[PDB]
Amino acid sequence: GVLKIVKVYLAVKRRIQPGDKMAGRHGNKGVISKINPIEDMPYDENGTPV
Amino acid sequence: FLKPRLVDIEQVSSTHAKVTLEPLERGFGHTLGNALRRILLSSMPGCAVTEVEIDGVLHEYSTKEGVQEDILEILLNLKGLAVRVQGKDEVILTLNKSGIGPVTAADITHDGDVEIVKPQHVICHLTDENASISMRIKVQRGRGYVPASTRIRPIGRLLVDACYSPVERIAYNVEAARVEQRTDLDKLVIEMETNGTIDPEEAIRRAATILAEQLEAF
């Protein structure tokens, strides 16, 4: 009953954003609540942000 | 109240350097250091790759016969390119390369008002004896991080996320200063780490100019 099939493959890039789950390997899941700026994250004595 | 001045700029490496501000009153070293650190990390102006046009490439989810890397990896390597255009605020570099070997950033036929500060920066590897890449890399000047999914056309021009921020790491220390007859005077050592496309002195001057212009509300 069909003549021809056309399949179109869309590819999207999903960036991380507040809302989607991130986990570890030890059953510690969580949902991102804020994407904090670089200068607002804690830093050590060498200035490297966390 | 005394005032601080840029007394020393120790350019230890090609990228990361230290500037020194002295003398500073007690309790002002931390204030100035943290304000300058936040302004440098947030609001410095730089140049970044924004649009790329490879010759026979339609989308970034494809490959080119001859190169060892996907077009996505080439786009990421171009995203990590350090360039110091001087007069304009938008330029188009043209990379042409053929033959087996790496394609470093030195293979960019850059103009007079363009400076590639890391010529050893690899982009992609050509693995075929007759395989050539001819790409148009659009470098433009901006501020902060502006992803390609928020800006604003043919099926050839690929968009890369642009990170116009020359500084990568900023740290600061405060330590007692050497004055002839005085104590409780601090000295601020700002140890910054750019990618090479900015001057530490003009970085500090821009940060202070931005801070003063914000304070000009009152």
PDB file of N, CA, C and O in Angstrom, chain A residues 11-13 15 38-49, chain B residues 34 37-38 41-42 60-61 72 145 147 161 169-172 191:
ATOM      1  N   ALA A  11      19.879  16.167  13.766  1.00  0.00           N
ATOM      2  CA  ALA A  11      20.840  16.056  14.853  1.00  0.00           C
ATOM      3  C   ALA A  11      20.832  17.353  15.643  1.00  0.00           C
ATOM      4  O   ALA A  11      20.990  18.434  15.067  1.00  0.00           O
ATOM      5  N   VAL A  12      20.641  17.244  16.953  1.00  0.00           N
ATOM      6  CA  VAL A  12      20.600  18.395  17.839  1.00  0.00           C
ATOM      7  C   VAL A  12      21.733  18.267  18.844  1.00  0.00           C
ATOM      8  O   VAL A  12      22.172  17.169  19.191  1.00  0.00           O
ATOM      9  N   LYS A  13      22.205  19.412  19.325  1.00  0.00           N
ATOM     10  CA  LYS A  13      23.159  19.469  20.423  1.00  0.00           C
ATOM     11  C   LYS A  13      22.424  19.931  21.668  1.00  0.00           C
ATOM     12  O   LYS A  13      21.833  21.015  21.678  1.00  0.00           O
ATOM     13  N   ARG A  15      22.916  21.154  25.315  1.00  0.00           N
ATOM     14  CA  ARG A  15      23.833  21.699  26.300  1.00  0.00           C
ATOM     15  C   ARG A  15      23.251  21.514  27.691  1.00  0.00           C
ATOM     16  O   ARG A  15      22.033  21.439  27.858  1.00  0.00           O
ATOM     17  N   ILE A  38      31.698  31.929  36.452  1.00  0.00           N
ATOM     18  CA  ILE A  38      33.027  31.472  36.841  1.00  0.00           C
ATOM     19  C   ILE A  38      33.535  32.235  38.054  1.00  0.00           C
ATOM     20  O   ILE A  38      34.161  31.651  38.944  1.00  0.00           O
ATOM     21  N   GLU A  39      33.273  33.534  38.122  1.00  0.00           N
ATOM     22  CA  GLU A  39      33.783  34.356  39.207  1.00  0.00           C
ATOM     23  C   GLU A  39      32.971  34.215  40.485  1.00  0.00           C
ATOM     24  O   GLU A  39      33.372  34.754  41.517  1.00  0.00           O
ATOM     25  N   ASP A  40      31.849  33.502  40.443  1.00  0.00           N
ATOM     26  CA  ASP A  40      31.031  33.276  41.624  1.00  0.00           C
ATOM     27  C   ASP A  40      31.288  31.934  42.287  1.00  0.00           C
ATOM     28  O   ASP A  40      30.812  31.716  43.404  1.00  0.00           O
ATOM     29  N   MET A  41      32.014  31.033  41.635  1.00  0.00           N
ATOM     30  CA  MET A  41      32.316  29.745  42.220  1.00  0.00           C
ATOM     31  C   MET A  41      33.456  29.868  43.226  1.00  0.00           C
ATOM     32  O   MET A  41      34.287  30.771  43.126  1.00  0.00           O
ATOM     33  N   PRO A  42      33.505  28.979  44.218  1.00  0.00           N
ATOM     34  CA  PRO A  42      34.614  29.006  45.173  1.00  0.00           C
ATOM     35  C   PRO A  42      35.939  28.693  44.502  1.00  0.00           C
ATOM     36  O   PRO A  42      36.009  27.933  43.536  1.00  0.00           O
ATOM     37  N   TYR A  43      37.004  29.291  45.028  1.00  0.00           N
ATOM     38  CA  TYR A  43      38.336  29.115  44.473  1.00  0.00           C
ATOM     39  C   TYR A  43      39.334  28.915  45.601  1.00  0.00           C
ATOM     40  O   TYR A  43      39.123  29.373  46.724  1.00  0.00           O
ATOM     41  N   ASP A  44      40.423  28.219  45.297  1.00  0.00           N
ATOM     42  CA  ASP A  44      41.466  27.950  46.269  1.00  0.00           C
ATOM     43  C   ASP A  44      42.539  29.032  46.194  1.00  0.00           C
ATOM     44  O   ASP A  44      42.375  30.058  45.531  1.00  0.00           O
ATOM     45  N   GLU A  45      43.657  28.806  46.883  1.00  0.00           N
ATOM     46  CA  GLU A  45      44.717  29.806  46.965  1.00  0.00           C
ATOM     47  C   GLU A  45      45.445  30.024  45.650  1.00  0.00           C
ATOM     48  O   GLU A  45      46.153  31.028  45.522  1.00  0.00           O
ATOM     49  N   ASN A  46      45.308  29.126  44.680  1.00  0.00           N
ATOM     50  CA  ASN A  46      45.867  29.327  43.354  1.00  0.00           C
ATOM     51  C   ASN A  46      44.884  29.989  42.403  1.00  0.00           C
ATOM     52  O   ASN A  46      45.229  30.225  41.242  1.00  0.00           O
ATOM     53  N   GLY A  47      43.674  30.294  42.861  1.00  0.00           N
ATOM     54  CA  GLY A  47      42.684  30.955  42.044  1.00  0.00           C
ATOM     55  C   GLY A  47      41.850  30.053  41.165  1.00  0.00           C
ATOM     56  O   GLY A  47      41.004  30.559  40.419  1.00  0.00           O
ATOM     57  N   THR A  48      42.051  28.743  41.223  1.00  0.00           N
ATOM     58  CA  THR A  48      41.339  27.829  40.339  1.00  0.00           C
ATOM     59  C   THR A  48      39.909  27.626  40.823  1.00  0.00           C
ATOM     60  O   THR A  48      39.710  27.147  41.943  1.00  0.00           O
ATOM     61  N   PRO A  49      38.901  27.952  40.021  1.00  0.00           N
ATOM     62  CA  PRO A  49      37.515  27.799  40.470  1.00  0.00           C
ATOM     63  C   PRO A  49      37.087  26.342  40.513  1.00  0.00           C
ATOM     64  O   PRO A  49      37.703  25.468  39.901  1.00  0.00           O
TER      65      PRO A  49
ATOM     66  N   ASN B  34      39.522  41.509  45.074  1.00  0.00           N
ATOM     67  CA  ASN B  34      38.363  40.721  44.685  1.00  0.00           C
ATOM     68  C   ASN B  34      37.522  41.433  43.638  1.00  0.00           C
ATOM     69  O   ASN B  34      36.994  40.784  42.727  1.00  0.00           O
ATOM     70  N   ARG B  37      39.408  40.904  40.459  1.00  0.00           N
ATOM     71  CA  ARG B  37      39.336  39.516  40.023  1.00  0.00           C
ATOM     72  C   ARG B  37      37.993  39.215  39.377  1.00  0.00           C
ATOM     73  O   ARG B  37      37.930  38.592  38.311  1.00  0.00           O
ATOM     74  N   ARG B  38      36.904  39.661  40.003  1.00  0.00           N
ATOM     75  CA  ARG B  38      35.585  39.398  39.443  1.00  0.00           C
ATOM     76  C   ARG B  38      35.393  40.119  38.117  1.00  0.00           C
ATOM     77  O   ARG B  38      34.832  39.551  37.171  1.00  0.00           O
ATOM     78  N   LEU B  41      37.583  38.250  35.425  1.00  0.00           N
ATOM     79  CA  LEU B  41      37.003  36.971  35.036  1.00  0.00           C
ATOM     80  C   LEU B  41      35.704  37.147  34.264  1.00  0.00           C
ATOM     81  O   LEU B  41      35.380  36.322  33.404  1.00  0.00           O
ATOM     82  N   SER B  42      34.953  38.210  34.543  1.00  0.00           N
ATOM     83  CA  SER B  42      33.646  38.363  33.920  1.00  0.00           C
ATOM     84  C   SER B  42      33.686  39.196  32.643  1.00  0.00           C
ATOM     85  O   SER B  42      33.148  38.779  31.614  1.00  0.00           O
ATOM     86  N   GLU B  60      28.321  20.045  10.632  1.00  0.00           N
ATOM     87  CA  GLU B  60      29.380  19.668  11.552  1.00  0.00           C
ATOM     88  C   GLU B  60      29.331  18.203  11.954  1.00  0.00           C
ATOM     89  O   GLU B  60      30.265  17.724  12.601  1.00  0.00           O
ATOM     90  N   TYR B  61      28.274  17.483  11.587  1.00  0.00           N
ATOM     91  CA  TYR B  61      28.135  16.070  11.904  1.00  0.00           C
ATOM     92  C   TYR B  61      28.569  15.183  10.747  1.00  0.00           C
ATOM     93  O   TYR B  61      28.022  14.094  10.555  1.00  0.00           O
ATOM     94  N   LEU B  72      33.399  18.213  13.771  1.00  0.00           N
ATOM     95  CA  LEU B  72      33.122  18.692  15.120  1.00  0.00           C
ATOM     96  C   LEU B  72      34.410  18.938  15.897  1.00  0.00           C
ATOM     97  O   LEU B  72      34.537  19.949  16.599  1.00  0.00           O
ATOM     98  N   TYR B 145      30.737  34.945  27.249  1.00  0.00           N
ATOM     99  CA  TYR B 145      30.434  33.717  26.525  1.00  0.00           C
ATOM    100  C   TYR B 145      29.087  33.871  25.836  1.00  0.00           C
ATOM    101  O   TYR B 145      28.061  34.025  26.505  1.00  0.00           O
ATOM    102  N   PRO B 147      26.915  31.761  23.291  1.00  0.00           N
ATOM    103  CA  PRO B 147      26.763  30.514  22.539  1.00  0.00           C
ATOM    104  C   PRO B 147      26.085  30.736  21.198  1.00  0.00           C
ATOM    105  O   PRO B 147      25.353  31.703  20.987  1.00  0.00           O
ATOM    106  N   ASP B 161      30.543  28.080  19.158  1.00  0.00           N
ATOM    107  CA  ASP B 161      30.366  28.876  20.363  1.00  0.00           C
ATOM    108  C   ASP B 161      31.603  29.727  20.602  1.00  0.00           C
ATOM    109  O   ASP B 161      32.737  29.255  20.503  1.00  0.00           O
ATOM    110  N   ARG B 169      42.558  32.218  34.412  1.00  0.00           N
ATOM    111  CA  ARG B 169      42.675  32.075  35.853  1.00  0.00           C
ATOM    112  C   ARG B 169      43.201  33.369  36.448  1.00  0.00           C
ATOM    113  O   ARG B 169      44.176  33.934  35.952  1.00  0.00           O
ATOM    114  N   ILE B 170      42.551  33.832  37.510  1.00  0.00           N
ATOM    115  CA  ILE B 170      42.963  35.023  38.239  1.00  0.00           C
ATOM    116  C   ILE B 170      43.101  34.648  39.704  1.00  0.00           C
ATOM    117  O   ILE B 170      42.208  34.013  40.272  1.00  0.00           O
ATOM    118  N   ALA B 171      44.215  35.034  40.312  1.00  0.00           N
ATOM    119  CA  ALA B 171      44.409  34.872  41.741  1.00  0.00           C
ATOM    120  C   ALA B 171      44.973  36.171  42.287  1.00  0.00           C
ATOM    121  O   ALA B 171      45.549  36.972  41.553  1.00  0.00           O
ATOM    122  N   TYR B 172      44.805  36.392  43.585  1.00  0.00           N
ATOM    123  CA  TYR B 172      45.389  37.589  44.166  1.00  0.00           C
ATOM    124  C   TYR B 172      45.837  37.290  45.587  1.00  0.00           C
ATOM    125  O   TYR B 172      45.236  36.471  46.284  1.00  0.00           O
ATOM    126  N   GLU B 191      48.043  37.645  40.303  1.00  0.00           N
ATOM    127  CA  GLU B 191      48.632  36.632  39.437  1.00  0.00           C
ATOM    128  C   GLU B 191      47.568  36.176  38.452  1.00  0.00           C
ATOM    129  O   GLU B 191      46.680  35.395  38.798  1.00  0.00           O
TER     130      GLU B 191
END
